From a paper:
The 14-3-3 family of eukaryotic proteins are abundant, medium sized proteins (~30 kDa subunit mass) endowed with a well-characterized phosphopeptide-binding ability. The human 14-3-3 family comprises 7 isoforms (β, σ, ζ, γ, τ, ε, η), that form all-helical W-shaped homo- and heterodimers. More specifically, 14-3-3 s bind protein partners that have phosphorylated serine and/or threonine residues presented in a specific molecular context. To aid structure determination, we have developed a streamlined approach based on chimeric 14-3-3 proteins fused to the sequences of interacting peptides.
PKA-dependent phosphorylation and subsequent interaction of the transcription factor Gli, a central player in Hedgehog signaling, and the steroidogenic acute regulatory protein StARD1 with 14-3-3 proteins have recently been reported, however, no accurate structural information on these complexes was available. For chimeric protein construction, we have chosen the main phospho-site of Gli for pCH2 and the first potential 14-3-3 binding motif of StARD1 (RRSS57LLGS) for pCH3. The pCH2 crystal structure was determined at 3.2 Å resolution. There is one 14-3-3 dimer per asymmetric unit; forming a closed cyclic structure with its symmetry mate where a single subunit of each dimer contributes its phosphopeptide to the binding site of the closest subunit of an adjacent dimer having its own binding site occupied by a sulfate ion (sulfate was present in crystallization condition). In the inter-dimer complex, the central Ser640 is bound by the same canonical residues of AG as in pCH1 and other 14-3-3/phosphopeptide complexes. Interestingly, this binding mode leaves the two opposite AGs unoccupied by the two remaining phosphopeptides which are unresolved in electron density maps. Instead, these ‘unbound’ AGs appear to be occupied by sulfate anions present in crystallization media at high concentration. The quality of electron density maps allowed unequivocal tracing of all linker residues of the Gli-derived phosphopeptide, except for the C-terminal alanine. Interestingly, two closely packed phosphopeptide-binding 14-3-3 subunits belonging to two different dimers, form Cys38-Cys38 disulfide bridge. However, this interaction is distant to AGs of each subunit and does not appear to interfere with 14-3-3/phosphopeptide interactions.
Residue numbers in the entry:
A (entry chain A): 1 to 71, 77 to 233
B (entry chain B): 2 to 71, 78 to 108, 112 to 207, 210 to 230, 234 to 244
The structure:
């Protein structure tokens, strides 16, 4: 069998910063149809986060140029469309993996939340580029994925859990940027922060590291969305 | 069309999409037309980044492969990366040889680029082949050095860049650390001499700084006397 080899190669690709290869290896490993361990889920996420991150960054540059020139010819639109299409291909691939293999009405709650957060994240990336037609559905598919994830995490995981914090952080970004609900973004972020803060002495070192890093991102967004 | 491919290559540079940038520049070249100064740099920037990423990865994987057996996945994947890297170098050398040609200034530039890409093949070549590739890199650089020395000022950034890379070739590839250091100091001392002199100062000085860096890396600067502390 080559599942273990695909996973070993994905770890090598991570060290070599070959994220497209990392994503492909993890995709193939998922497709062997066995659940992923904690380590393996993170490899899947790291890989696609980086792949899509690069496409999004590029799309932003190109879209920004396209808009500021509309008072550099058809080339900007054509190339922005190429990048956009490619990006959608990645999100569709990731959502295809989540729906066909990973998300299940079964198993522990953390991994359930992890995949639904991932589902919200990738529908949110589709929403970043979508036009009014697709937009509404997509925004809503992102909202339900996050909301379902939020409901589980709130009942099953501590407020200091990094998957829970990460979920809240991203859902608040969704509110601010995508849904155009800056109030619930600010509110969710403050609430998340304060609830986690109250529970910090229950966390000992090592877990405190992971969680305070995400709490620092919440504080940063809050300061940005308001004042220092 | 050609002008569109060049416009798209500029956009790809801004979006940091170097594989796309390389492909657009390849297509623009393929259309014969000599490249302007700006266009040559776009070609170089694109492939420098593409191959840079493959080299960095190859470095990591080869390093793991060597430290480890002192596991077939490492070899297989290192081979995949290596093969892909060779494909890029072969593509670039194919462009240089196929659509090479005009003037002395630009002739240096392409021969330097020819030396650079044969040097990247040498970074991974095994034996019978490695030894030949090293010479194709050496002649490309040497021919370019001879032109630059007779036609360009010692402050010229293409000339400085060529010297810098040829000296790297000597230390790393040819295992001639003596001429690598000789060449690198000679190059920086000859440029330092005529520094005061349009105004491309900052352009040139950046490459001078790389020569001192790589020389300090190979004691540090000049002799040491008692440091007051």
């Amino acid at each position: 069998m080559e599942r273990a080899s695909l996973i070993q190669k994905a770890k090598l690709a991570e060290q070599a910063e070959r994220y497209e290869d990392m994503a492909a290896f993890m995709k193939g490993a998922v497709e062997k149809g066995e659940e992923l361990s904690c380590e393996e889920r993170n490899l899947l996420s790291v890989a696609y986060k980086n792949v899509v991150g690069g496409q999004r960054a590029a799309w932003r540059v190109l879209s920004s140029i396209e808009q500021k020139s509309n008072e550099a010819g058809p080339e900007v639109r054509e190339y922005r469309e190429k990048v956009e299409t490619e990006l959608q291909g990645v999100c569709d691939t990731v959502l295809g993996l989540l729906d066909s293999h990973l998300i299940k009405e079964a198993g522990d709650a953390e991994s359930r939340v992890f995949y639904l957060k991932m589902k919200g994240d990738y529908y949110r990336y589709l929403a970043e580029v979508a036009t009014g037609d697709d937009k509404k559905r997509i925004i809503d598919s992102a909202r339900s994925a996050y909301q379902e994830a939020m409901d589980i995490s709130k009942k099953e995981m501590p407020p200091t859990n990094p998957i829970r914090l990460g979920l809240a952080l991203n859902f608040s970004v969704f509110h601010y940027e995508i849904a155009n609900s800056p109030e619930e973004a600010i509110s969710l972020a403050k609430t998340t922060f304060d609830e986690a803060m109250a529970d910090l002495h229950t966390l000992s070192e090592d877990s405190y590291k992971d969680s305070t890093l995400i709490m620092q991102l919440l504080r940063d967004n809050l300061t940005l969305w308001t004042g220092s």
